[PDB]
Amino acid sequence: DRVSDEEKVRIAAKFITHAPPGEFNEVFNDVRLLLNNDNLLREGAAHAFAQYNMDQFTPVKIEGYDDQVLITEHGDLGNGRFLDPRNKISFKFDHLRKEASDPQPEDTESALKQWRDACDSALRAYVKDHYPNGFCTVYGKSIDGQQTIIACIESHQFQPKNFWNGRWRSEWKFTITPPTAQVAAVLKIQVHYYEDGNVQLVSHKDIQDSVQVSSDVQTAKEFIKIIENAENEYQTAISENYQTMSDTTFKALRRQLPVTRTKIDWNKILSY
Amino acid sequence: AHKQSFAKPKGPAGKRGIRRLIR
Amino acid sequence: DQQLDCALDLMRRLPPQQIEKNLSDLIDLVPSLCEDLLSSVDQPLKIARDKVVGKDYLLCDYNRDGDSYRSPWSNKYDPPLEDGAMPSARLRKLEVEANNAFDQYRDLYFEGGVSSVYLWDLDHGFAGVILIKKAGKKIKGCWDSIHVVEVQEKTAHYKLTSTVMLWLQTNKTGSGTMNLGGSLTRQMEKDETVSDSSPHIANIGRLVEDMENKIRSTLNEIYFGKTKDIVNGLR
Question: Where do the H-state alpha helices sit in chain A?
Fold first, then answer.
């Protein structure tokens, strides 16, 4: 009759990893009271809290350092530590409180570091110019023997008092095979409005591109221009598609009024 | 028109069986 | 209870695109919630075929007896039942008239789809459900209406509890994949004259029409206004 501990954890993890942006605490609290097994939730679903933060690109402030660093899979150093590649530190991250502690120096020197730094510098300016309170983190790694730059952007607005929350995430991977670089990206938007009922927008777009590679500073300039053009285009297309969706799909599901352009004559209906 | 504020009526009397999801 | 309120709060936050699996997961997690949770949260509508009359009809708890469901056209259960629950003779006549009335209603507002009406007796009147489903490769959508009406005959007092589930998805070059899903519930009340001028079905029809028009406009404002403005506030 009892639900196995394995299934309680699996279902808790499922709800947690599907929490809207900015609503982790509410979903965690619902789940806690449904399970009535705090140690099982905290130990058994630990992987789910970490997965949520890394999926969401959760930004965190590290005491004593400008700006915030993103929690992502690319920064996961294991044992609950993450990498801040701009400030060249690792730090402990509490996935429940979303708090950073215990910063320690991290040796990040490599032949790719100059490229990561040039891309990071160009990306920071880009994000500050194009987002209201965006953050970004740039990684440089060897992936199957290939030098890779990974640029991550996050921007959110949480307004629980007005019952809505939203988040933008984008992830740009540049595989550098001189004299070229291959570009693969995903852009993502999630919005939850729940003043009346429960409405959610979920959107994503895949991007593939190629680019010529020159110097580290000039290539960074070109990388950010690709990002800028694609993200500008995606955003405008979104806003335009709202109008089109209403004009086509929405009206096709239910009209505002019958073709008579008046509400129904029910005595006419019943007399037929 | 307003948010949920009163109870829905009872369903048909003398129905047999528990509620369940349809697949 | 608190576990029910937590379940209902989770359904307010988990992706509406997955209402069915959300409910199933909650009931698996806490089986004693099943009855109250399924009576509080409507599920997406499912279509069945009445092979006797040759017509589609919609499934809900209100036309379910055991594991069979009653068609509003044939007034028979599928699979057949020995003595399944059935409206009184007086109400069945009203039920036939209501299904025909709401077929016309649905044609005029939805230009397709499927509708079903089921009525049942109460001590001092009757109650009913009005169900409407309309569907839309790269451009999909679904509207599901569930209207539950309570009628207390005195003149008559009508109480209406209405849920609309609406989701739309596009997959396009510029905007990639865009998915809007949601669920909204509203209630209204009304006293009416009952006569050959305004019989019960006309009173109920006007109530349902008013409610759906109002909910449609609210969905329009939230989907294509509020979430759009939030998106643009993100960047």
Answer: 5-17, 24-35, 38-39, 46-56, 113-130, 216-245, 251-253, 266-270
Q: Name the 3-class secondary structure at C45.
A: coil
CB-based contact C213 A256, cutoff 8 Å: yes
Identify the chains in contact with B, defined as 3+ C-beta pairs within 8 A. Answer: C
Residue of B nearest to C22 (CA): B21
Which of C100, C178, C232 should be substituted to probe chain A, the one whose Cβ sees the most A Cβ atoms within 10 Å?
C178
In chain C, what are the domain boundaries? 1-87, 88-235
Neighbours of A102 (CB within 10 A): 12
Query: Chains A, C: CB contacts under 8 A, how many?
Result: 237
Residue A74 burial (10 A CB sphere; 0-12, 13-18, 19+): buried
Could you state, in order of their start, the residue ranges of all structural domains in chain A? 1-108, 109-253
Tokens 């402030």 locate to A61
Q: Tell me which chain C residue has its CA closest to the CA of residue A196.
A: C184
Select the residue of B4, B16, B20 nearest C185 (Cβ to Cβ). Answer: B4
Which tokens is C170 given?
């596009």
Tell me: cis bond preceding B12? Omega within 30 of 0 counts: no
User: Which residue's structure tokens are 């429940």?
Assistant: A96
Q: What backbone phi and psi angles, to 5 degrees, belong to C163?
A: -120, 135
What is chain A's Cα-based Rg? 23
User: What's the gap in Å between the CA of C114 and the closest CA on chain A?
Assistant: 12
**Resolution rounded to one decimal, in angstroms:** 2.0
Q: Is residue C91 within 8 Å of residue C85, measured between CB atoms?
A: no
C234–A166 C-beta distance less than 8 A:
yes
Using what technique was this structure determined?
A: X-ray
